[PDB]
Amino acid sequence: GKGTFERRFFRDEKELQEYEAAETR
Amino acid sequence: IVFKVNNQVVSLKPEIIVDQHEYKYPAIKDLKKPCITLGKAPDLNKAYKSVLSGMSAAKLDPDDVCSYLAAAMQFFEGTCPEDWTSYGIVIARKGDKITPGSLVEIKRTDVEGNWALTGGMELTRDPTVPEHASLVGLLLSLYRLSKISGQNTGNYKTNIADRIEQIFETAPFVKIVEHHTLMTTHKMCANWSTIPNFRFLAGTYDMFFSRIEHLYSAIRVGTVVTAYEDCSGLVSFTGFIKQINLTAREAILYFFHKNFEEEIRRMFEPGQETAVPHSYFIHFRSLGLSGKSPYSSNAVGHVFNLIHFVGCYMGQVRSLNATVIAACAPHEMSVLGGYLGEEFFGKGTFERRFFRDEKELQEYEAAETRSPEAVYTRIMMNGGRLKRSHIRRYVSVSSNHQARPNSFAEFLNKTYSS
Amino acid sequence: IVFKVNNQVVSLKPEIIVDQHEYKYPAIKDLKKPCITLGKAPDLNKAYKSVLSGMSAAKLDPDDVCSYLAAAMQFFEGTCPEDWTSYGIVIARKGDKITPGSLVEIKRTDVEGNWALTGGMELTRDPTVPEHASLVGLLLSLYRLSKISGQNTGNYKTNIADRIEQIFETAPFVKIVEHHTLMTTHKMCANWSTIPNFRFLAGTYDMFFSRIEHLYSAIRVGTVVTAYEDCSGLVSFTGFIKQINLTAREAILYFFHKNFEEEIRRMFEPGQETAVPHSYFIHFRSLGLSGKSPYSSNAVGHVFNLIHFVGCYMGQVRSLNATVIAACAPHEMSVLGGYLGEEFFGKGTFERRFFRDEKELQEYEAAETRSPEAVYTRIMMNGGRLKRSHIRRYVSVSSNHQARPNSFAEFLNKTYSS
């Protein structure tokens, strides 16, 4: 019932970099 | 990569497991039409006579049937409505008459065919073109019949066969094979899908009749299966896009896992004429350049599982009866599917698009939230764990629907029983 | 459009999905009446013996049947009540006698028909015009019997056939085919609806009997289906307008989604005689000048789905039993339908219109809210999400109904069930 989820797909490279700037398995 | 344990000293054993993945993509760089090897050309009339008796006789000859189909390709021809651009090949141009014989290259050997007939044919005269079309369509339906198989397919495999006979017993086709001969011949020839030349020919027929409207286009009922062969993953994704009412791009944004990366790349190779309306691509698994399909439900297993887990959350029966790809981490996919399903079930993005007058549009132009970011944060707040409501919804959908053995529904029932 | 994603690189991939259609509109710019080519005109009496024998024997030749129907068009003649202009062509002048033979252009080739005797015909004398009209009606009725084929039913097709037999066995028609022959011959002619010339003739007869009252106008019992054929989307929209008690324009304002734009534009393309009472448009699909119809339920799938989701919310049986267009974002349509149905269910716009005196009418000059803006803002307040009452209502309607296979009732049951 648990998954390790992270945003992987973005419209922009800049968007990707911002997400990189941003209970545990 | 090596991970180490100590017995008396440090051991540093490496971990090795088999996970080979080789997928060939469909593209014509040599500019060569698909090629298969065939037998000696028979006399059209004699070939029709032999195959009709053989079919009535429940006698299956692979070489004879395919050779007959190749000869019959000359009967069906039409002018191309518009210029046809494929994988560097342009066999059809607007105002140019085309045939199945022109679309692919068939290698004919002078080796004589057996053209042997058990019997049951009383026709003493040369066949008409419709009779030829009726027989041609029946064989292609044998191919579709072979694909059926399954379990608990009683009164369904019979039903599809009945539909086929009905088409070819009514105009423009003429009844040549009485009734239930096609069903009983299929019992004799259930695994004919395996034969490559039979499959290739069915694909050629389906491509020509789909491109050109014809009097005998109904033969496509047998050859419809050839379209998007072994591409259910790509097909499921396109359907997922339409059911969810998103653009392909926005749809992929919601895929919050590393495993999707390989699959997204796999299904969107550069070029590949996926977007092209009429192309070799639709029938790449048939014909040639098949390889193993990188678009199959297995090749794109994580995306496939997520799509249908989302579908089950929304009560899509298609997803409920799809067979889950067990290898591709179904549990994690169901959790992401729960969050995606809750977001998309019962919710829509609405905006005023119609106005009485231009000034009203300008006023609206001068003037909880659905976004990937919002969903991701929601998942993070719950520590990447399903909400209890997700579990309830999943349980309610699986319990009311009848579960097939390897379906998503069965997995949902077994996984969450409370 | 654009993507950023890879295992360890920032790969940029444009995602490609295939979605193309044609949707050709009906229009006569050439000013030539619709035309079909067929064989040499037979002697009516001889042709009548052949097709009757064929009827009783359950074996019919499509080309021979079509030539007889085109030859029989001269029999039916009537005065035109008003001047008749369809598109650029003026088919007839007011007070001019006309036949079905004038409505379209019929071109006959010198080719001879088989007109062969297969089944029991007992007429030793020349047939009368009633016998001809009884047979013409019986032949055209096969078209309707062909179309109404589908899942389950059976009793429905059987009931329509016996009703058709009753019409042509009662005056002004004479019984020529005893009983139950129409149903049994239809089993052999089940797909005759596919035949283009047969469809063209049924549509021509229907268009003629629509405008011109005739003694044998009862033939329409078979050809009635051709009217607005394959235009269920447009018909559903007009019906949605009348039951909901709104004007065409005001109703479209309630369509708060981008998807509707393409469909609204498609179905309201100008220059097509949608508004004209007796235009070629009412039977365009049956005649030529069609292609695929842009007014079919699939063509306007989103509008169609919203119309019937509102109807289900309001308990309309027609909507409960319509087959949902799965491609056209049913879930989002169901949500908008829930809000719209809530607005229109149990509510009416009432005003005093009838008064005792003229002075009382003038007195009534000085004298919750139904508007697109109110509904849209109501939708926005709940974040585009169905209210709990919406789901209760949808479930109550779907469950207390015998859900048809792919009906809106079935979708509603599967989707909202807890």
Numbering used by the authors:
A (entry chain G): 351 to 372, 398 to 400
B (entry chain H), C (entry chain I): 6 to 372, 398 to 448
Publication excerpt:
As for all non-segmented negative RNA viruses, rabies virus has its genome packaged in a linear assembly of nucleoprotein (N), named nucleocapsid. RABV N is composed of two globular domains that are connected by a hinge, creating an RNA binding groove. It also comprises two subdomains, an N-terminal extension, named the NNT-ARM, and an internal loop in the C-terminal domain, named the NCT-ARM, that dock to neighboring subunits in the polymeric form and thereby stabilize the assembled NC. Thus, genome replication requires the production of the unassembled RNA-free N protein, named N0, in the form a complex named the N0−P complex, in which P prevents the polymerization of N and the illegitimate assembly with cellular RNA until N is transferred to nascent viral RNA.
The structural alignments using PDBeFold showed that NCTD in our refined NΔ230−P68 structure was similar to that in the N−RNA complex (RMSD = 0.84 Å), while the NNTD exhibited some differences with residues from 35 to 103 and from 189 to 200 being out-of-register in the structural alignment despite an RMSD of 0.95 Å. An analysis of the original electron density map of the N−RNA complex revealed that the absence of density for residues from 105 to 118 and 185 to 188 and the low resolution of density had resulted in the incorrect positioning of the latter region relative the remaining NNTD (see below). For NΔ230−P68, the C-terminal part of P68 (res from 42 to 68 + tag) remained flexible and sampled a wide range of conformations, consistent with the SAXS-based ensemble analysis. In the MD simulations of the N3−RNA system, the C-terminal domains remained stable as previously found, but the N-terminal domains started to unfold in the first 100 ns of the simulation, reflecting possible packing defects due to the incorrect construction of the protein segment from residue from 135 to 200 (see above). We thus re-refined the N11−RNA model against the original dataset using more recent software and the model of N extracted from the NΔ230−P68 structure (built from higher resolution data), which yielded an improved model of the circular undecameric N−RNA complex. Using three adjacent N subunits (N3−RNA) from the re-refined N−RNA complex structure, the MD simulations showed that the N protein structure was stable over several hundred ns in multiple independent trajectories. The first crystal structures of polymeric, circular N−RNA complexes revealed that the RNA molecule was embedded in its protein shell, with some bases facing the protein away from the solvent. This directly suggested that the N protein must open and close, with the NNTD and NCTD moving relative to each other by rotation around a hinge located in their connecting region. The binding of RNA, NNT-ARM, and also NCT-ARM blocks N in a close conformation that shields the RNA from the solvent, cellular proteins, and the viral polymerase.
